[PDB]
Homo-oligomer: A and B are copies of this chain.
């Protein structure tokens, strides 16, 4: 239910696909990826901690833009 927003420095479509893959693997998420604006929105019951950790697995620089 909570709606989180993250900054992920994706710089190509492949970067976006990889973010998609780690989120798909985690599961229990509803996400939206805005490549041009380096933003990823995630609606999930998973803690912000878990979402942050999952996104960091990509090797990309990740920051929190907060709750919607």
**Chain A interface, DSSP helix/strand/loop, else mixed:** helix
Q: Knowing that A9-B14, A14-B15 touch, tell me 10 more A-B residue pairs with CB under 8 angstroms.
A: A11-B12, A11-B13, A12-B12, A18-B18, A20-B59, A21-B59, A22-B58, A25-B59, A58-B58, A58-B59
Interface hits, A39-60 → B, CB 8 Å: 57-60
Copies in the complex: 2
Complex interface: chain B residues within 8 A of A21 (CB): 59-60
User: A30 CA to B11 CA in the complex, in Å?
Assistant: 25
Complex interface: chain B residues within 8 A of A13 (CB): 11
Interface flag for A34 (CB, 8 Å): no
Size range of the interface on A?
A: 10 to 19
